[PDB]
Amino acid sequence: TTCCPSIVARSNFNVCRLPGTSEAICATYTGCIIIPGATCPGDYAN
């Protein structure tokens, strides 16, 4: 599951994913994170 720190970061993550880029590369590029669970924390609410 991906969790993003702001709405900007989420929007940038979604563009990064359009060509098929790995989630892990899009995470370091945007500041979003990948967790094994389904419950994003409050500081990664977007």
Curated annotation (Swiss-Prot):
Pfam families: Thionin
Protein localization: Secreted
Record GO biological process: defense response
GO cellular component, one term: extracellular region
Keyword field: Disulfide bond, Plant defense, Secreted
Disulphide-bonded residues: C3-C40, C4-C32, C16-C26
Domain of life: Eukaryota
Ranges annotated as spanning the membrane: none
Similarity remark: Belongs to the plant thionin (TC 1.C.44) family.
Further remarks about this protein from its record: Two isoforms exists, a major form PL (shown here) and a minor form SI.
Entry function: The function of this hydrophobic plant seed protein is not known.
Identification of the protein by name: Crambin
Organism: Crambe hispanica subsp. abyssinica
